[PDB]
Amino acid sequence: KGCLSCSKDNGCSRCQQKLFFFLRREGMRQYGECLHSCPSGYYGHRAPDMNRCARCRIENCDSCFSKDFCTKCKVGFYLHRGRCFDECPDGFAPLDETMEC
Amino acid sequence: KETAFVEVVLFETTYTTGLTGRFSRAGATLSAEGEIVQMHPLGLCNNNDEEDLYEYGWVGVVKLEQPELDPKPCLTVLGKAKRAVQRGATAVIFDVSENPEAIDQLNQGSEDPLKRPVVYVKGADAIKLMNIVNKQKVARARIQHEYFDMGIFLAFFVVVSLVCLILLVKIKL
Amino acid sequence: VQLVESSLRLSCAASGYTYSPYCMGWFRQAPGKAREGVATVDLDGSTIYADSVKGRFTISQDNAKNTLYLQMNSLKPEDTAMYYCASRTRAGVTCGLNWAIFSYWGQGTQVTVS
Amino acid sequence: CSCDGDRRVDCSGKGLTAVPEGLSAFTQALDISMNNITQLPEDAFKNFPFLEELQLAGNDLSFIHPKALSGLKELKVLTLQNNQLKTVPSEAIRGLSALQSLRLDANHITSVPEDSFEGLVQLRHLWLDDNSLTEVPVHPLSNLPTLQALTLALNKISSIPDFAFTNLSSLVVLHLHNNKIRSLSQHCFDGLDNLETLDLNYNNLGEFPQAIKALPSLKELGFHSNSISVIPDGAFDGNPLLRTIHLYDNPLSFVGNSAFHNLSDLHSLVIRGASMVQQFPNLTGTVHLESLTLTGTKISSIPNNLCQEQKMLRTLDLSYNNIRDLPSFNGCHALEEISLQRNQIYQIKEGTFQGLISLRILDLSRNLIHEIHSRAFATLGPITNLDVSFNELTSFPTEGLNGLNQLKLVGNFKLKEALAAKDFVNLRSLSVPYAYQCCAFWGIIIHCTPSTGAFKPCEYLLGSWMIRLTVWFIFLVALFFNLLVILTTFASCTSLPSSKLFIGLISVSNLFMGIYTGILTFLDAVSWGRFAEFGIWWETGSGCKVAGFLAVFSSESAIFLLMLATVERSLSAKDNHLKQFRVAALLAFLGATVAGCFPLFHRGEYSASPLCLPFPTGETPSLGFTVTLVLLNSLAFLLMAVIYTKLYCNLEENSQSSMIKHVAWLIFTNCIFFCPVAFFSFAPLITAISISPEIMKSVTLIFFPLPACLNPVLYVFFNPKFKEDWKLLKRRVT
C-alpha cells in the first residue's frame, strides 16, 4: 500500500519517501492514497516534505510533464512544443501518423 | 459555543438521524443546511497552487488527525476552516476527537469573526457521523441555532414584611 | 566477444574480442543486490580497487595469454558472493567501479569462504 | 497477467521476479512496475519486439544487462523512476533510437558517465529530479539537441558552470528548484532559446542571477524561496515575454526603481518586506497588471498616472507603507479591492474615490483619518465591505453607503454620534466603538460586534418595573432612615461613646450609598426608554465617575467602620481610647476616599457599565483592582467573624449586650449581602460556568445598596439607645 497511517475513514495521509500523495474523491468522501506515478490527467510534483499528485492545468492535455508542458495531448489536437493546437502552425505536417507537428 | 442538534438526511425518501455538536465562538450561530462532503485535512491549505471549485452550498466534514502526525502543517484549523468557506462551505464540522487542541485553537480564533458557523463534534456522535458519511454516497446536513426579577422582588418584599411583622409583634407587647 | 570466467585465483578469458582490451574489471554480487566493483584495470595499467578490497586483492591483465587474473588473499567470511568479469572494448568514459559503463559480462562463479 | 485485447498488458503488482512468459508478441505496452524485479538478463525482451511503452517503476532494480533492451527499436517511453539504480544505465539505453520519454526520478543516481545518452536521437522528456547529483551532466546532456523537457529538481547541485546547456537548443522547460544552488555564472543559460519555464525556487541563491539575459523566450520565472536581497535595475531586460515572476519568501530590501519595466505580459506583481525601497516603482510598459501589492515599504506617495495606465488593474494592496496623501483614483474602472490599511492618511477628500465603479472592498483601518468628506463615498458604485477601524474619527458620512454588507468602525473612540439605521438598509455586519451605537439596528438581521446585552442597556437603565420599584424603595428607605439616624445621634453632641460614633459614621456612609442609588433612579427615570441616547454620554462623562466614586467610597467606608466597631467591642469586652477611635475612624474614611479615587487615576474603571461600578461588571479589565478589593473585604469580614467568635467564647454587661448584638447583626447582614457580589464579580472570568448578565445586573442592583437601608432600620427599630436618643430629641425640640 506504501503508506504510513491509513486511517479507515480519513484515508491514508502520509506516504513513503518516494511515493506521491493523491486525494481521491467519490460520493461524499475524499481520502488520500499513495501511488508510484500520477494517474491520467495528473502530474507528480516532488518536494522534500511530501510528493504531491497535482492536476494538469494545460487545456486539451491528456498527460503532462508539468503544469504548463503536455506530453501526450487529446485525440483531436496536435502538440507543437508542449501545448495542444487544433490548427498546427506552418512548417510541419498536422498528423504525421501520430497527431503532432 | 451553543449546543446544536445536527441532523443528517438520507434521500434516495428522507431519513433523519440526529447528533449533538457544539458551536465555535470563532464562527457564527445560525441554521445552516446543505450537502455533506468529507474534506481531507491536507487538501485545505494555500500551499497548493491550483484547486477545483465546487458548487456553493456544500458542507465540509473535516476529521482532524493526531497533532504529532503532521508536525509541519501547511495551515491551521482556522486556515482550513476559512479555505473551506471560501470554496463554498456553508457549514463546517470538525471532528475534534483526534485533535483535542482544536477546541482551544477555535477559542483563540474566536476574536476574529467567521462568515459561516463552525460546529465541532467529539465522541459517539462523531463516530456515527463518520460511519454515515462513509456508508452513504449522497446525504444532507441541517444545523439549528427576562424570566427573572419576580422571585427576587417577592423575596425582598416578604423580607420587608417579615421585619415589619416583627416590629409590630414587639410593639404589641 | 564472449567472456568466460572461472587464497583463490579467479581467471577470466576473452576469446572473442578482436583487440584493444580496454577498462576490464571484476564485480561481486550478493543475492538480489547490485553488482559492486572490486578491482578495475585500465589499458595503461592503472588499477582502481574498492575500500574493502585494496591490499587483500590484486588485479593483473596479461595480453600474452589474453586473460585477466584476480588474486584474493585472506578471504574474510563476508567475502562470499558471485563474481563476474566485465569488459569494455569501446572508449570515451573514465574508468571506475561503475557497472553501467561495461559492455560485456562473464558468467560468474560462486565464491564461498573455504 | 491482465492481458488485454488492445495489446496492452498490465503485470503490475503480481510479485513476479522476471519478465513474464506466455504473452503475445504483438504487445505495445508492458507494465511490470510494482512486482519486485532486481535485474534484467540478456535478451530479457526478445519476445516483445513491438514494445512502445515499458514501465519498470517501483521494482528493486539494481542491474540492467547491456543487451537487455536490445532489439527495442520501437520503444518510445521508458519508466525506471523508483528503482535502486545508482547510475545512469549508459550502456543499457544505447541503441534506443526511438525513445522519447525516459524516467529516472527516484533512483539514487550519483554518477552520470560521460558517454550517457548517446544514440538517443529522439529523446524529448528526461527525468532526473530525485537523485543525488552534485553536478550538471554537461557532456552527457550535450548529446540531446532534441530534448524539450528536463528536470534536475531534488538533486544536491550547488553551482552551474558556463555553457552548461549550450546544445539544448530545443529545450522548453527546465526545473532546478530544490537543489542547493548558490552560484550561477553569467553564461550558464547560453544557447537556451525556446526556453519558457525556468525553476529555481528552493536554492540557496545569494544575488539575482545575470544569466537570465540569454533567455528571450522566458515566460515564467520562479526563484521565490531563495535568499535574494537586491533586485537590480534591468534585471529582466532580456525577458520581454515574462508573465509570472515568483519572488515571495526572499528576504528583500531593495528592488530598484525600474526592475519591473516594459514587461507587457506581466499580470501580477507582489512584493513584500522591501524596507529599503522608498519610491513607487516605474511601471511604464507594464500595463497588463491585474494585481499589484507593495506591502512592506517606505513609499510615501502614489503616482497620479497609476490609473491612467494599468487599465486592467483589479486588486491594489499598498497597506504597510507610509502613505500620507491619496491620489485621485479617476480611472481604474476595473479596480475592485483597495487595501490601504496601516498607512498614515489624515483625511479623505470628496474626489478621492471619484468614479471608481466596481469597487467592492475598501480597507482604511489603522490610519490617521480625522476627516471624511460628506460625499466621499457618494460616487462609489456597488461597495460591500468598508473598514475604517482605528482611525480617529469624529463623524462618519452616510451617503452612498446604503448597499454595504459589512462596516467596521471599532477603534474610533471619538465617534460618539449614533448611526441612523435608515441608511444602511442592506447592512449585515457592523462594528462600532460603543455598544450603544448598535441600538438603532437591534437584531434582515444585523450582527454587531459590541453586544448590547444587559450591562449596556438599550432602552431602560434599571430594567423591569419590579427592579425599578425595588431600587426606588431602597433609595427612599436608605435616604430617610439614614437622615433620621444621623440627626438623632448627632443632635445631642454632648456624649459620644465609641459605639455611638461608629453607628453614626456607618449611617453617614449608608446615606452616601443612598445618594448613589438616587442618582441611578433619577437617571433611569429621565432616560425612560431612550437610554441608548444617554449611554455613551453617561459612561464617558463625569457623571459615571462621580457615581462610581460615591458607590466605592460608601461600601469601603461601611466595611472599615464595621471592622473598627468590632475591634472596639472586643477591646471593651477585654477591658480611654475615644481619641484613638476617632483617629481610626478618620483614617478609615480617608482610606475609603483614596480607594474610591484610585479608579479615577486608573483608566477604564468606571466606564464598564452605566451602573458605574468598577468590580462587579468587569472581570478581565481591572482584574488586579477587583481582586484587591474583594480580598480586602473578605479579610475584613473574616476578622470580624473571628473577633465576634472570640468575644462570644470568652465573655459570659447589661448595657453592653445591646451594642454587642447590634454589631453582630450588622456584621452578619453585611457579610451575607457582600458574598454574592464577590461571587458574581468572579463569575464571568471563569469560562467553565456561565451566568446570565441580566441576573448579574439585577442581583447587583438589589444587593449592593441593600445594607445601606437595612442598617438604619435595624438601629431605629431594635435599639433602646435610639429610643432614648429620640426621646432626648423630642425634649430638645420641645
mmCIF file of C-alpha atoms in Angstrom, chain B:
data_model
loop_
_atom_site.group_PDB
_atom_site.id
_atom_site.type_symbol
_atom_site.label_atom_id
_atom_site.label_comp_id
_atom_site.label_asym_id
_atom_site.label_seq_id
_atom_site.Cartn_x
_atom_site.Cartn_y
_atom_site.Cartn_z
ATOM 1 C CA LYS B 1 -20.470 27.795 21.843
ATOM 2 C CA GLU B 2 -24.158 26.905 21.864
ATOM 3 C CA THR B 3 -25.069 23.222 21.744
ATOM 4 C CA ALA B 4 -26.723 22.372 18.418
ATOM 5 C CA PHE B 5 -28.732 19.385 17.218
ATOM 6 C CA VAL B 6 -27.218 18.478 13.839
ATOM 7 C CA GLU B 7 -29.297 16.100 11.721
ATOM 8 C CA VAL B 8 -28.146 14.129 8.673
ATOM 9 C CA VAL B 9 -30.719 13.351 5.983
ATOM 10 C CA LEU B 10 -30.544 10.378 3.618
ATOM 11 C CA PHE B 11 -32.530 10.793 0.394
ATOM 12 C CA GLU B 12 -32.897 8.067 -2.228
ATOM 13 C CA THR B 13 -37.434 9.183 0.813
ATOM 14 C CA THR B 14 -35.999 11.268 3.663
ATOM 15 C CA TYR B 15 -34.450 9.568 6.704
ATOM 16 C CA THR B 16 -33.208 11.804 9.524
ATOM 17 C CA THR B 17 -30.585 10.858 12.123
ATOM 18 C CA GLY B 18 -29.564 13.289 14.849
ATOM 19 C CA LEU B 19 -26.441 14.096 16.840
ATOM 20 C CA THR B 20 -25.067 16.813 19.119
ATOM 21 C CA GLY B 21 -22.298 19.267 18.281
ATOM 22 C CA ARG B 22 -21.000 22.421 19.912
ATOM 23 C CA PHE B 23 -20.762 25.716 18.056
ATOM 24 C CA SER B 24 -17.498 27.649 17.944
ATOM 25 C CA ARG B 25 -17.185 31.264 19.041
ATOM 26 C CA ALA B 26 -14.904 31.792 16.031
ATOM 27 C CA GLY B 27 -17.875 31.147 13.742
ATOM 28 C CA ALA B 28 -21.432 32.425 13.806
ATOM 29 C CA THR B 29 -24.555 30.682 15.131
ATOM 30 C CA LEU B 30 -27.346 30.167 12.599
ATOM 31 C CA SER B 31 -29.348 27.473 10.826
ATOM 32 C CA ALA B 32 -27.057 26.102 8.102
ATOM 33 C CA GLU B 33 -28.321 23.436 5.705
ATOM 34 C CA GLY B 34 -26.823 21.776 2.659
ATOM 35 C CA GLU B 35 -24.939 18.853 1.180
ATOM 36 C CA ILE B 36 -22.240 16.982 3.107
ATOM 37 C CA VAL B 37 -18.783 16.109 1.770
ATOM 38 C CA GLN B 38 -15.679 14.976 3.624
ATOM 39 C CA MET B 39 -12.593 17.152 3.188
ATOM 40 C CA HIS B 40 -9.112 15.817 3.846
ATOM 41 C CA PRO B 41 -7.063 17.966 6.260
ATOM 42 C CA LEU B 42 -4.145 18.037 3.810
ATOM 43 C CA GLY B 43 -6.390 19.166 0.953
ATOM 44 C CA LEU B 44 -7.310 22.523 2.509
ATOM 45 C CA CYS B 45 -4.339 24.877 2.501
ATOM 46 C CA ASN B 46 -2.896 27.583 0.262
ATOM 47 C CA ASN B 47 0.351 25.726 -0.497
ATOM 48 C CA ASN B 48 -1.427 24.002 -3.405
ATOM 49 C CA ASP B 49 -1.354 26.446 -6.315
ATOM 50 C CA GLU B 50 -4.478 25.186 -8.109
ATOM 51 C CA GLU B 51 -7.781 23.888 -6.761
ATOM 52 C CA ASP B 52 -11.075 22.524 -8.061
ATOM 53 C CA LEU B 53 -14.099 24.593 -7.055
ATOM 54 C CA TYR B 54 -17.419 23.056 -6.035
ATOM 55 C CA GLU B 55 -20.956 24.418 -6.153
ATOM 56 C CA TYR B 56 -21.688 26.934 -3.407
ATOM 57 C CA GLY B 57 -23.774 25.243 -0.729
ATOM 58 C CA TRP B 58 -21.820 22.166 0.301
ATOM 59 C CA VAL B 59 -20.985 21.358 3.926
ATOM 60 C CA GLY B 60 -17.485 20.259 4.867
ATOM 61 C CA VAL B 61 -16.837 17.417 7.299
ATOM 62 C CA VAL B 62 -13.179 17.598 8.351
ATOM 63 C CA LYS B 63 -11.755 14.867 10.584
ATOM 64 C CA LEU B 64 -8.621 16.183 12.257
ATOM 65 C CA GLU B 65 -5.614 13.923 12.741
ATOM 66 C CA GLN B 66 -3.268 13.487 15.681
ATOM 67 C CA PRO B 67 -1.302 16.694 16.386
ATOM 68 C CA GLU B 68 2.047 14.889 16.163
ATOM 69 C CA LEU B 69 1.044 13.193 12.895
ATOM 70 C CA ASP B 70 1.843 16.390 10.942
ATOM 71 C CA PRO B 71 4.474 18.447 12.810
ATOM 72 C CA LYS B 72 4.639 20.834 9.809
ATOM 73 C CA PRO B 73 1.045 21.793 8.962
ATOM 74 C CA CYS B 74 0.548 23.890 5.845
ATOM 75 C CA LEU B 75 -2.152 25.882 7.679
ATOM 76 C CA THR B 76 -4.005 25.899 10.992
ATOM 77 C CA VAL B 77 -7.503 24.792 11.970
ATOM 78 C CA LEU B 78 -8.835 28.282 11.267
ATOM 79 C CA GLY B 79 -6.908 28.271 7.986
ATOM 80 C CA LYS B 80 -8.630 25.061 6.923
ATOM 81 C CA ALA B 81 -11.990 26.487 8.018
ATOM 82 C CA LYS B 82 -11.527 29.711 6.042
ATOM 83 C CA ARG B 83 -10.337 27.829 2.953
ATOM 84 C CA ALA B 84 -13.381 25.552 3.170
ATOM 85 C CA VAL B 85 -15.735 28.528 3.488
ATOM 86 C CA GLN B 86 -14.022 30.194 0.518
ATOM 87 C CA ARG B 87 -14.545 27.036 -1.539
ATOM 88 C CA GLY B 88 -18.257 27.319 -0.717
ATOM 89 C CA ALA B 89 -18.817 25.505 2.580
ATOM 90 C CA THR B 90 -21.999 26.778 4.211
ATOM 91 C CA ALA B 91 -21.147 24.740 7.320
ATOM 92 C CA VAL B 92 -18.029 23.035 8.674
ATOM 93 C CA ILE B 93 -17.991 20.063 11.062
ATOM 94 C CA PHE B 94 -14.595 19.492 12.698
ATOM 95 C CA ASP B 95 -14.316 16.083 14.353
ATOM 96 C CA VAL B 96 -12.030 17.110 17.214
ATOM 97 C CA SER B 97 -11.842 13.601 18.663
ATOM 98 C CA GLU B 98 -8.317 13.006 17.349
ATOM 99 C CA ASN B 99 -7.200 16.630 17.923
ATOM 100 C CA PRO B 100 -8.324 17.941 21.330
ATOM 101 C CA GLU B 101 -6.300 21.121 20.730
ATOM 102 C CA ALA B 102 -8.768 22.203 18.030
ATOM 103 C CA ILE B 103 -11.147 23.487 20.721
ATOM 104 C CA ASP B 104 -8.570 25.902 22.123
ATOM 105 C CA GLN B 105 -7.474 26.805 18.588
ATOM 106 C CA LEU B 106 -11.056 27.836 17.795
ATOM 107 C CA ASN B 107 -11.287 29.672 21.128
ATOM 108 C CA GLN B 108 -8.141 31.628 20.250
ATOM 109 C CA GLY B 109 -9.682 32.305 16.843
ATOM 110 C CA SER B 110 -12.906 33.499 18.468
ATOM 111 C CA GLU B 111 -11.565 37.062 18.358
ATOM 112 C CA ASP B 112 -11.702 37.040 14.549
ATOM 113 C CA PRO B 113 -15.311 36.532 13.383
ATOM 114 C CA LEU B 114 -16.024 33.930 10.719
ATOM 115 C CA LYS B 115 -18.531 34.178 7.888
ATOM 116 C CA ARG B 116 -20.238 30.821 8.480
ATOM 117 C CA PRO B 117 -20.907 28.712 11.586
ATOM 118 C CA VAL B 118 -18.370 26.224 12.933
ATOM 119 C CA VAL B 119 -19.509 23.036 14.684
ATOM 120 C CA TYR B 120 -17.165 20.649 16.478
ATOM 121 C CA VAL B 121 -18.274 17.127 17.396
ATOM 122 C CA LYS B 122 -16.437 14.595 19.557
ATOM 123 C CA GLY B 123 -17.316 11.095 20.707
ATOM 124 C CA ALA B 124 -20.050 8.652 19.734
ATOM 125 C CA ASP B 125 -21.807 11.351 17.708
ATOM 126 C CA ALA B 126 -18.596 11.928 15.747
ATOM 127 C CA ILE B 127 -18.194 8.176 15.225
ATOM 128 C CA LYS B 128 -21.752 7.788 13.931
ATOM 129 C CA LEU B 129 -21.362 10.832 11.670
ATOM 130 C CA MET B 130 -18.207 9.325 10.168
ATOM 131 C CA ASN B 131 -19.945 5.966 9.729
ATOM 132 C CA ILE B 132 -22.853 7.671 7.949
ATOM 133 C CA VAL B 133 -20.594 9.696 5.658
ATOM 134 C CA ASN B 134 -18.594 6.569 4.790
ATOM 135 C CA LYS B 135 -21.586 4.308 4.132
ATOM 136 C CA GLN B 136 -23.829 6.759 2.268
ATOM 137 C CA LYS B 137 -22.942 8.333 -1.073
ATOM 138 C CA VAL B 138 -25.459 11.220 -1.057
ATOM 139 C CA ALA B 139 -26.772 12.973 2.051
ATOM 140 C CA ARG B 140 -27.555 16.374 3.541
ATOM 141 C CA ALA B 141 -26.942 18.104 6.866
ATOM 142 C CA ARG B 142 -29.067 20.542 8.870
ATOM 143 C CA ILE B 143 -27.804 22.633 11.804
ATOM 144 C CA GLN B 144 -30.049 24.775 14.010
ATOM 145 C CA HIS B 145 -29.208 27.527 16.485
ATOM 146 C CA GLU B 146 -36.339 38.407 31.418
ATOM 147 C CA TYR B 147 -37.707 35.208 33.009
ATOM 148 C CA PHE B 148 -36.478 36.591 36.348
ATOM 149 C CA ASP B 149 -36.837 39.695 38.559
ATOM 150 C CA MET B 150 -40.026 38.310 40.116
ATOM 151 C CA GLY B 151 -38.564 35.865 42.636
ATOM 152 C CA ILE B 152 -36.022 38.365 43.940
ATOM 153 C CA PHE B 153 -38.666 41.111 44.104
ATOM 154 C CA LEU B 154 -41.069 38.920 46.071
ATOM 155 C CA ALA B 155 -38.244 37.761 48.353
ATOM 156 C CA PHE B 156 -37.236 41.357 49.089
ATOM 157 C CA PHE B 157 -40.798 42.394 49.853
ATOM 158 C CA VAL B 158 -41.532 39.372 52.053
ATOM 159 C CA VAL B 159 -38.326 40.207 53.948
ATOM 160 C CA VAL B 160 -39.668 43.745 54.397
ATOM 161 C CA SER B 161 -42.993 42.290 55.549
ATOM 162 C CA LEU B 162 -41.185 39.998 57.999
ATOM 163 C CA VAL B 163 -39.283 42.929 59.513
ATOM 164 C CA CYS B 164 -42.491 44.960 59.810
ATOM 165 C CA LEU B 165 -44.295 41.991 61.383
ATOM 166 C CA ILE B 166 -41.515 41.527 63.945
ATOM 167 C CA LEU B 167 -41.653 45.235 64.793
ATOM 168 C CA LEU B 168 -45.445 45.129 65.152
ATOM 169 C CA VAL B 169 -45.472 41.997 67.319
ATOM 170 C CA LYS B 170 -42.765 43.535 69.518
ATOM 171 C CA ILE B 171 -44.696 46.794 69.911
ATOM 172 C CA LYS B 172 -47.841 44.799 70.740
ATOM 173 C CA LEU B 173 -46.228 43.624 73.991
#
